[PDB]
Design a protein around this ligand. Structure first.
Ligand code: OZC
Ligand code: OZC
Lengths: 304, 304
C-alpha cells in the first residue's frame, strides 16, 4: 500500500543525455543512434530572441559550429537539419547506450516523467502531466532546455517531450521529438497566453479510486449521479468534461473497488460543492489530477 | 522557476538491482562489488514470520539455496552471512556497473530517493523523507522488499535505506545498508507502534523560502517572532522544535530572499494559527515538509 508521485526509472534516458553548444549558447541534447536532437533556439543569441528567423540564423551555421559533448567525449557532427523547432545533428558515432525507442506525441491529461538536465548531465527526475492547456507545470531553470519527457513500456522508451521554454507565467512549454510544439506556443521571446488550465477529471477520479484502494474512504457517499448532471458541476468548477471513454478507461478501477464510476462521480461532485472541510485524501488537501488510470493501475499492481 | 518533488536520477542504482530467491520467497537485492545485500527475511516463510529465529533459520540454509539473478544471468553464491537484519551473499563476480558508493545512516527529516523494484527489476522512482518517527510514507507492494533509498553526490551513491516491511498502519519500515532498522521496528510480523509523526519544521521553512523564490509570497506577513515563541506554537501543532542549527542551515535561503529566518517563522506561525483559507503554496493546500534546505538550494540552483 501507499500512493506516491512516481516517475519511471531514468537510467535508459540518462545514457542519451549530451551537451550541445552552439556559439555562446549551451543546452541539452538527446543522442539516439547517430542523431542528436535539441531545441533549435541553440543557434540564437539573447539579442535575436525577440524575433528569430531560424532559416536565416541556421544558414550562418556550419557542422563544426555545433559542439556536441557526451560526458567527456566530443562527437563529430557530419550533418545538421531543422525539423520544425528542433535541430537534428548527425554525428559520426551511434550511441552505444541507445535503448529501444519511439517518438510519440502524447495527449493532454497524459502523464510522463521528466529528466531535468544541465550541461548534458541529469540532475533530477519527476512525474508530471501535459496540462489541458498544453503547458507543463515543471521545475526548470536556465540551462534545462533539451531536457526530455518520456514513458517506458518494459524496455521501450517513448519520448514525448522536449523542453524549450518557460512562459512569463512560470509554466513550461516544449515540443514532441519531431519539433512540434504542444499548444499554440512559438519559440519566440514574446507575450504568449497559456490559456485556461482545467482539471483532468478522469485523473482526479482515478486518484479517488487509488485512495479507496489504499484505505482513505471518508469521501465516499450514499449518492449517485449521471454523466450530464456531473458534467454541469465539472463545467462550473473548470473540470474537463467527462466522456463515456473516460468512464470505460476507469472500468478496471471500478471493478477492483466495486464502486461504479457514476457513484465515484457523485462523491467527487460533493467534494467540489463542499470542499474537504480540512481533511486530506492520500496525504493531500486538494484533488490531484496528475495520475492517469494507467498510472493508478500500474502503481497498485506493480508493473516493472 | 517551478518547484517539484524531484528524485535523483536512478540509473546508477538500477545497475545494482538483482533478484534474490530463497526457497519460495523472492525479493530485491543490491549488488555492489562481489556482495548482494538483501533483507534477511528472504529465508523466512509466511508460517515462521510471527516469531523467526533467524540464526536457526539461516543454519538450515546453504550457499546454493540462495538464487541471485541479475537481469537474466545467475550469480554464483560463494559465501553468505547475516549482519543485523540483512544478508550479505558473496558472489563470484563483481558488478561491472558498481558505481562509487557509501553506506550512510541518515537522520530523521532527511530526504532520499527510492527506486521501487519487483523481482530485481526497477519500476518507479520517487522522493521521500525519513519521518521523525523513523518510518517512511512510501509506495510499496508485496515484492518491493530490498528496494533501496539513496542520495547522489556528483558520481557517488550514498545508500541509506533498504525496504523490509509495511506496518499495519500502511507506512513503511526498513534498515540502513548495515541491517540496522531505523526506529524501534523488528523484522517480525507483530503489532508494532510507529509512534507520533511530527512535521519537519526546518523542511516546511525551506519549502516556504522555495515558494518566495518562485513567486508565491501571499503568506508573507508584517510580523516577526522569536525561537521560543515560535516553538510554543510548533509544540501545539506537533511540529519539530526549531533549533539554532536549523536557523543556521536556513541561512543561505534567508540570504537569497532577504527574509530573516524569524520573520519566516512568524509567517509560518500565522499559517498554523489561521490555516490557508482555501489558498495554495507551490500548488499545495498543505504545508510541505519533504524538502530539506539542501534540496531547495539544489533545485533552485541546478546542481548536476
Ligand atoms: O525560457 C527560456 C528562455 C527562452 C526564450 C526564448 C525562447 Cl525562443 C526560448 C527560450 C532562454 C533560455 C532558457 N529558458 C528557460 C527555460 N526553462 C526554465 C527557465 C528558467 C529561468 C529562465 C529561463 C528558463
Ligand atoms: O511487510 C511485508 C511482509 C513482512 C512481514 C513480516 C516481516 Cl518480518 C517482513 C515483511 C511480507 C513481505 C512483504 N511485505 C510488504 C512490504 N511492503 C509493502 C507491502 C504491501 C502489501 C503487503 C506486503 C508488503
Amino acid at each position: 500500500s501507499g500512493f506516491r508521485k512516481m516517475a519511471f526509472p531514468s537510467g535508459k534516458v540518462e545514457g542519451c543525455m549530451v551537451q550541445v553548444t552552439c556559439g555562446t549558447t549551451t543546452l541539452n541534447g538527446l543522442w539516439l543512434d547517430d542523431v542528436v536532437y535539441c531545441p533549435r533556439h541553440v543557434i540564437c543569441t539573447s539579442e535575436d530572441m525577440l524575433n528569430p528567423n531560424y532559416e536565416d540564423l541556421l544558414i550562418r551555421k556550419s557542422n563544426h559550429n555545433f559542439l556536441v559533448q557526451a560526458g567527456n567525449v566530443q562527437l563529430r557532427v557530419i550533418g545538421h537539419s531543422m525539423q520544425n523547432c528542433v535541430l537534428k545533428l548527425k554525428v559520426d558515432t551511434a550511441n552505444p547506450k541507445t535503448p529501444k525507442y519511439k517518438f510519440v506525441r502524447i495527449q493532454p491529461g497524459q502523464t510522463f516523467s521528466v529528466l531535468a538536465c544541465y550541461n548534458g548531465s541529469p540532475s533530477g527526475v519527476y512525474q508530471c502531466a501535459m496540462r489541458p492547456n498544453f503547458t507543463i507545470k515543471g521545475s526548470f531553470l536556465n540551462g534545462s532546455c533539451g531536457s526530455v519527457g518520456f514513458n517506458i513500456d518494459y524496455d521501450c522508451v517513448s519520448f514525448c517531450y522536449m523542453h524549450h521554454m518557460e512562459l512569463p507565467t512560470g509554466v513550461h512549454a516544449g515540443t514532441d521529438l519531431e519539433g512540434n510544439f504542444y499548444g499554440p506556443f512559438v519559440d519566440r521571446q514574446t507575450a504568449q497566453a497559456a490559456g485556461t488550465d482545467t482539471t483532468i477529471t478522469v485523473n482526479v477520479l482515478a486518484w479517488l479510486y487509488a485512495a479507496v484502494i489504499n484505505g482513505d474512504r471518508w469521501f465516499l457517499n450514499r449518492f449517485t449521479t449521471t454523466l450530464n448532471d456531473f458534467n454541469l458541476v465539472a463545467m462550473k468548477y473548470n473540470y474537463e468534461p467527462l466522456t463515456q471513454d473516460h468512464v470505460d478507461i476507469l472500468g478496471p478501477l471500478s471493478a477492483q473497488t466495486g464502486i461504479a464510476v457514476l457513484d465515484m462521480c457523485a462523491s467527487l461532485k460533493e467534494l467540489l460543492q463542499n470542499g474537504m472541510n480540512g481533511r486530506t485524501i492520500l496525504g493531500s488537501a486538494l484533488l490531484e489530477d496528475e495520475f492517469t488510470p494507467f498510472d493508478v493501475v500500474r502503481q497498485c499492481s506493480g508493473v516493472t
